[PDB]
Design an enzyme around this catalytic site. Structure first.
Site, mmCIF file in Angstrom:
data_model
loop_
_atom_site.group_PDB
_atom_site.id
_atom_site.type_symbol
_atom_site.label_atom_id
_atom_site.label_comp_id
_atom_site.label_asym_id
_atom_site.label_seq_id
_atom_site.Cartn_x
_atom_site.Cartn_y
_atom_site.Cartn_z
ATOM 1 N N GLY A 197 -22.589 -3.586 -21.014
ATOM 2 C CA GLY A 197 -22.613 -4.200 -19.700
ATOM 3 C C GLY A 197 -23.044 -3.233 -18.612
ATOM 4 O O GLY A 197 -23.381 -2.080 -18.891
ATOM 5 N N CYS B 90 -36.591 13.537 -27.154
ATOM 6 C CA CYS B 90 -35.298 13.012 -27.638
ATOM 7 C C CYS B 90 -34.755 11.913 -26.742
ATOM 8 O O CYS B 90 -34.183 10.942 -27.230
ATOM 9 C CB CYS B 90 -34.263 14.118 -27.797
ATOM 10 S SG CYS B 90 -34.640 15.268 -29.143
ATOM 11 N N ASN B 91 -34.939 12.044 -25.429
ATOM 12 C CA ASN B 91 -34.421 11.018 -24.527
ATOM 13 C C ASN B 91 -35.135 9.695 -24.781
ATOM 14 O O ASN B 91 -34.507 8.641 -24.804
ATOM 15 C CB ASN B 91 -34.581 11.421 -23.050
ATOM 16 C CG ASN B 91 -33.650 10.621 -22.120
ATOM 17 O OD1 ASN B 91 -32.568 10.179 -22.530
ATOM 18 N ND2 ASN B 91 -34.072 10.433 -20.875
ATOM 19 N N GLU C 234 -1.157 -1.144 -4.160
ATOM 20 C CA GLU C 234 -2.118 -0.067 -4.282
ATOM 21 C C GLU C 234 -1.344 1.244 -4.284
ATOM 22 O O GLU C 234 -0.575 1.497 -3.353
ATOM 23 C CB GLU C 234 -3.136 -0.066 -3.141
ATOM 24 C CG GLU C 234 -4.173 1.011 -3.356
ATOM 25 C CD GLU C 234 -5.030 1.280 -2.146
ATOM 26 O OE1 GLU C 234 -4.462 1.518 -1.060
ATOM 27 O OE2 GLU C 234 -6.274 1.272 -2.295
ATOM 28 N N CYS D 3 -31.984 18.476 -30.226
ATOM 29 C CA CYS D 3 -32.937 19.054 -31.199
ATOM 30 C C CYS D 3 -33.128 20.565 -31.049
ATOM 31 O O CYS D 3 -33.838 21.178 -31.832
ATOM 32 C CB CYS D 3 -34.318 18.394 -31.097
ATOM 33 S SG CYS D 3 -35.270 18.974 -29.662
ATOM 34 N N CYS E 271 -34.517 17.068 -24.043
ATOM 35 C CA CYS E 271 -35.975 17.086 -23.875
ATOM 36 C C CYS E 271 -36.433 15.652 -23.724
ATOM 37 O O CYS E 271 -35.710 14.705 -24.055
ATOM 38 C CB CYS E 271 -36.716 17.748 -25.068
ATOM 39 S SG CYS E 271 -36.655 16.750 -26.614
ATOM 40 N N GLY F 102 -23.733 -0.567 -15.818
ATOM 41 C CA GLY F 102 -23.246 0.775 -15.571
ATOM 42 C C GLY F 102 -22.975 1.586 -16.825
ATOM 43 O O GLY F 102 -23.276 1.151 -17.958
ATOM 44 N N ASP G 144 0.862 -1.170 0.000
ATOM 45 C CA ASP G 144 0.000 0.000 0.000
ATOM 46 C C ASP G 144 0.900 1.222 0.000
ATOM 47 O O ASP G 144 1.465 1.572 1.026
ATOM 48 C CB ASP G 144 -0.889 0.015 1.262
ATOM 49 C CG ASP G 144 -1.663 1.335 1.441
ATOM 50 O OD1 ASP G 144 -2.379 1.755 0.518
ATOM 51 O OD2 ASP G 144 -1.566 1.954 2.523
ATOM 52 N N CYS H 11 -32.555 21.751 -25.454
ATOM 53 C CA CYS H 11 -32.154 20.370 -25.651
ATOM 54 C C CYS H 11 -30.929 20.315 -26.568
ATOM 55 O O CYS H 11 -30.932 20.885 -27.658
ATOM 56 C CB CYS H 11 -33.309 19.583 -26.259
ATOM 57 S SG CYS H 11 -32.878 17.931 -26.829
ATOM 58 N N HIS I 296 -26.966 10.142 -20.969
ATOM 59 C CA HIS I 296 -25.606 9.707 -21.268
ATOM 60 C C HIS I 296 -25.498 9.677 -22.795
ATOM 61 O O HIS I 296 -26.210 8.904 -23.454
ATOM 62 C CB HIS I 296 -25.326 8.307 -20.690
ATOM 63 C CG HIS I 296 -25.145 8.275 -19.200
ATOM 64 N ND1 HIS I 296 -26.199 8.372 -18.311
ATOM 65 C CD2 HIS I 296 -24.026 8.120 -18.441
ATOM 66 C CE1 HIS I 296 -25.738 8.282 -17.073
ATOM 67 N NE2 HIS I 296 -24.422 8.127 -17.125
HETATM 68 MG MG LIG Z 1 -24.658 -0.084 -19.454
HETATM 69 MG MG LIG Z 2 -31.101 8.507 -22.054
HETATM 70 MG MG LIG Z 3 -4.041 3.162 0.080
HETATM 71 ZN ZN LIG Z 4 -34.798 17.309 -27.996
#
Ligand SMILES: [Mg+2]
Ligand SMILES: [Mg+2]
Ligand SMILES: [Mg+2]
Ligand SMILES: [Zn+2]
Length: 977
Positions: free
Chosen positions: A467, A484-485, A384, A448, A481, A469, A8, A445, A461
């Site tokens: 996978g 679009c999402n 580490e 758009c 907006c 996360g 460490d 947005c 994102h």
């Molecule tokens: Mg993912």
């Molecule tokens: Mg999204």
């Molecule tokens: Mg440490």
């Molecule tokens: Zn939009």
């Protein structure tokens, strides 16, 4: 026999542990666990060394001139002045560019010049034309390039831009493309140039191999060779030197680098690193002090010495870029070595010119050697690394302060959200980023362009992650907006934009909007953000899945350490993880609050220094599948902080039955480990160690203006105290050899006194000089002696420049213990001998500053030399009798604190002691006594009272075990008795 070593690396310490596990990984024995505690500039010191050597060379030139019928200060003095001034400190030639020391000429009116053939003595003489100027690096020793034909070139430092470029190219030259299976081909020269140009565009980018695949126009899955050894690169390489130069807090240096000439970048790096021999720099450097100051020593260029010279590095680089050869093939073709040829690696402890790093490397090297000797070759060595972190105590302090800052900026952001939106309760990172993005994007947005507000907008994102996360960096998050999402779903932006057919949605429009961003109140941060966002808006492939290497450190020093360890232990699996892995592991296995360390826990920062040993033990037990699962849990957590919803990540222990079983088994192992560790704590065999300095400190120092000596007429007589402060030992001898010298009354007034000091007769009417710290208008008749030496213009104090203390027992009915502090100055004449048995005579400043009773005891043969201690030494002390004063109250709060470290010599009869196990920083509202003993003055205790309890001076080997004897003449433990 399965041995797992864990290390460490901290800013001020290294935890070390060795663990034996059975065939299925269950810890069965904690073999070792310990915490090793640690404890102008290079540029101008190189400058000064250079100055002195050059100076002596100019003196040699004058030597040549004088004996050549020339005067050192009308044609003759003219020739003198011309050759001295207009050439000797000017280094004009410097013609065909050569560091070859000696240098062949290769080549009224009658009065000047010549000669004719002679006075090439002069040409050869001009500071011997630097033949040879340097005694120190980079001439001795920077080892030569070991490639056949290259042996006249010195190996390059790894910070050299040419090495960085070589490294990047070499890695790229390992890459393969699959076009059909199984038909790997190397990248073509054009592809290689394309990728290298891309990797060097921005050393501050955080790229993955998916970015490289996209740049190449291939699916990630069809790009191979990313994991081949030249460790392999989990992430694409960058120019680490350029990155450091663009991120330095030294403003004008960064600014310079920005507009610098490239060849000048290289030359500058060489200058800053090891070569004090350019004109342009330090003609570049000298500007803007304070930056020139200790800031320059704060510049931490990538460490290490390359295997090859610059010449070889560029030859290999150009060849790999222009062909499809890898490094192995390149070296065979260019230099003709065979298939078995390999350059050696630097030893683990090979110095890198950085004090913290170097102390760490010496510790790791010797621990791993001792481990192998005692128990055999380890199957794994896991390390580490700390953070940022591991550059200095300075940079660590600064980063901590800036972290408290950023913490406060975040708290302010939270307050402002609570205020402006009336949000009661938990304010997630999602809330904060959403508002930040809304303001940045001017309530539109990003995809758009339509108007959105805090009620209507959603956080997206840009690029999804294969996978569990996501990549949760600010540069992958934008306000969007609801339409679009919903439409974009789990698709990368660029892919969705090409098929969605929504008005004003496209890559170009989105980029345009991003280029429109302006700060809402740090423009560097914003510029970086914009580049990241634009790059992600172009992406057509997902970010890659989290894996076992997601937790691997990518710091330069981490890779260099991995390299040295793996090379020294070729049969051992080596890994260097980032400094968050053990905290993550301890939380996931739930074992903080299971270890029986001192502390309320109460964390905060652990007050017990044995915690570094815990962290080393945990990292030793880490495994690939577990690292992956931890990285995933962390990513899932990041995601769920962005949605501010019910956090379920703690319930994630893997996506297959195999991953979940590994994780559960590992939690079991961690439980076993806490049992073994607690058991070892109860035996008191989790050690806290620290090195002691045995060698004489050398030079440096100076930078000191002398105090004034005080004059006393010899004939007016002198007290003993005045005599003991005589400005030289020789004067002291002469004063105390007087037939009427009295041990109490000194020297009486006399008009016929005559003494001899170094041949010189000193009479009653003459004046002698003494050290004094009092005004010349006050009396020094009773001023006691203190450590001082005469220098030009007076004297300087030699306060804490003490090398060791010798402990004596003054014999008698009531035996008395005392010590002699031996000043470094008094050992200079016996440097290469036994320092602890060198004679320290009565006239020495050391003896004269010792307790009078010890002086008298030594002079009459009534003092028994028990043994010696130094600052840094460990004392084991029975502290039962110490219940009075500050130490007693401290002991009330921390009872049975029996292990102490000598921090200094408070007076000529007292030691300053501080506890070994306790860290000041872990204190939370300490009682004034505890703060005094641990943090401020320490425990200041008289040698006689301390020695009455018979403490033990404890000396430890490389595994932290007490040493009671040595056939190697190493310092051993002894009880002061
Ligand atoms: Mg993912
Ligand atoms: Mg999204
Ligand atoms: Mg440490
Ligand atoms: Zn939009």
């Amino acid at each position: 026999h399965h041995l797992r070593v864990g290390i460490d690396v901290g800013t001020h310490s290294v935890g070390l542990a060795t663990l034996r596990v059975d065939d299925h990984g269950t810890p069965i024995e904690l073999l070792s666990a310990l915490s090793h505690i640690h404890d102008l500039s290079g540029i101008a010191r190189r400058a000064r060394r250079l100055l002195h050597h050059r100076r002596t060379q100019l003196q040699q030139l004058d030597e040549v001139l004088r004996d050549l019928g020339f005067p050192i200060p009308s044609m003759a003095v003219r020739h003198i002045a011309r050759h001295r001034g207009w050439r000797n400190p000017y280094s004009k030639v410097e013609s065909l560019l050569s560091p070859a020391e000696e240098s062949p000429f290769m080549k009224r009116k009658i009065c000047a010049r010549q000669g004719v053939s002679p006075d090439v003595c002069k040409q050869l003489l001009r500071a011997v034309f630097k033949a040879d100027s340097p005694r120190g690096s980079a001439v001795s020793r920077v080892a030569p390039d070991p490639l056949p034909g290259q042996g006249s070139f010195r190996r390059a430092p790894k910070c050299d831009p040419e090495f960085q470029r070589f490294r990047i190219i070499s890695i790229v030259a390992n890459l393969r493309i699959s076009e059909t299976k199984g038909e790997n081909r190397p990248l073509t020269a054009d592809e290689r140039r394309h990728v290298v140009t891309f990797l060097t565009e921005d050393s501050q980018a955080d790229l993955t191999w998916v970015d490289v695949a996209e740049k190449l126009g291939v699916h990630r899955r069809d790009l191979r060779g990313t994991a081949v050894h030249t460790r392999s690169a989990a992430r694409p390489p960058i120019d680490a030197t350029d990155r450091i130069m663009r991120q330095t807090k030294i403003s004008s240096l960064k600014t310079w680098w920005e507009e610098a000439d490239s060849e000048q970048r290289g030359a500058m790096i060489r200058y800053l690193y090891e070569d004090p021999t350019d004109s342009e720099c330090a003609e570049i450097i000298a500007e803007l002090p304070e930056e020139d100051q200790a800031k320059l020593d704060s510049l931490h260029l990538p460490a290490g010495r390359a295997a090859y010279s610059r010449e070889s590095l560029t030859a290999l680089s150009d060849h790999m870029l222009a062909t499809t050869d890898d490094l192995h093939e390149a070296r065979k073709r260019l230099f003709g070595v065979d298939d078995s040829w390999a350059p050696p690696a630097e030893a683990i402890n090979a110095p890198v010119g950085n004090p913290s790093v170097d102390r760490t490397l010496k510790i790791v090297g010797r621990y791993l050697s001792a481990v192998e000797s005692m128990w055999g070759t380890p199957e794994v060595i896991h390390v580490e690394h700390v953070r940022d972190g591991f550059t200095s105590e300075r940079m660590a302090d600064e980063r901590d302060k800036a972290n408290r800052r950023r913490y406060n900026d975040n708290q302010e952001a939270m307050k402002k959200i609570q205020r402006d939106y009336g949000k009661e309760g938990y304010i997630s990172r999602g809330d904060i980023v959403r508002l930040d993005a809304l303001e940045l994007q001017g309530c539109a947005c990003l995809y758009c362009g339509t108007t959105i507000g805090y009620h209507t907008c959603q956080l997206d994102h840009i690029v999804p992650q294969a996978g569990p996360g996501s990549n949760n960096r600010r540069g992958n998050l934008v306000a969007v907006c609801e339409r679009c999402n919903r439409s974009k779903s789990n698709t990368p932006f660029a892919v969705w934009a090409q098929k969605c057919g929504i008005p004003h949605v496209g890559v170009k429009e989105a980029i345009g909007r991003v280029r429109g961003w302006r700060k809402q109140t740090s423009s560097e941060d914003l510029t970086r953000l914009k580049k990241e966002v634009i790059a992600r808006l172009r992406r057509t492939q997902e970010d890659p899945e989290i894996d076992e290497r997601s937790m691997e450190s990518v710091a330069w020093m981490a890779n260099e350490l991995h390299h040295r360890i793996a090379a020294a232990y070729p049969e051992t699996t080596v890994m260097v993880y980032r400094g968050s892995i053990t905290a993550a592991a301890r939380k996931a296995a739930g074992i903080d609050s299971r270890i029986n360390l001192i502390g309320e826990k109460g964390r905060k920062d652990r007050i017990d220094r044995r915690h570094h040993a815990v962290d080393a033990s945990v990292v030793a037990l880490m495994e690939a599948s577990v690292a992956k699962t931890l990285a995933e849990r962390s990513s899932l957590r990041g995601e769920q902080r962005l949605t501010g919803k019910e956090q379920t990540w703690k319930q994630y222990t893997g996506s297959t039955v195999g991953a979940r079983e590994h994780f559960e088994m590992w939690r079991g192992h961690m439980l076993h480990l806490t049992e073994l560790f607690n058991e070892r704590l109860a035996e008191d065999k989790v050690y806290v160690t620290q090195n002691i300095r045995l060698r004489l400190s050398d030079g440096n120092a100076h930078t000191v203006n002398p105090s004034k000596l005080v004059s006393h007429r010899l004939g007016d007589g002198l007290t003993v105290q005045q005599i003991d402060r005589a400005c030289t030992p020789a004067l002291w001898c002469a004063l105390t050899r007087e037939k009427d010298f009295d041990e109490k009354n000194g020297l009486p007034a006399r008009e016929d006194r005559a003494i001899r000091v170094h041949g010189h007769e000193i009479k009653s009417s003459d004046y002698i000089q003494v050290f004094s710290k009092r005004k010349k208008t006050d009396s020094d008749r009773d001023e006691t002696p203190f450590g001082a030496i005469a220098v030009r213009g007076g004297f300087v104090e030699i306060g804490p420049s003490i090398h060791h203390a010798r402990i004596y027992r003054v014999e008698g009915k009531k035996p008395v213990y005392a010590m002699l502090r031996v000043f470094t100055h008094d050992l200079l004449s016996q440097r290469h001998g036994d320092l602890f048995s060198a004679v320290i005579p009565p006239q020495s400043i050391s003896m004269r500053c010792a307790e009078p009773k010890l002086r008298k005891a030594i002079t009459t043969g009534n003092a028994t030399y028990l043994g010696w201690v130094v600052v840094g030494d460990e004392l084991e002390i029975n502290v039962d009798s110490f219940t009075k004063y500050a130490i007693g109250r401290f002991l009330e709060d921390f009872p049975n604190t029996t292990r102490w470290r000598i921090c200094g010599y408070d007076t000529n009869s007292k030691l300053t002691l501080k506890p070994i196990v306790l860290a000041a920083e872990g204190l939370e509202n300490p009682s004034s006594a505890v703060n005094e003993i641990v943090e401020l003055k320490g425990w200041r205790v008289a040698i006689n009272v301390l020695t009455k309890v018979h403490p033990t001076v404890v000396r430890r080997d490389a595994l932290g075990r007490p040493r009671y004897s040595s056939r190697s003449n190493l310092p051993t433990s002894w009880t002061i008795e």
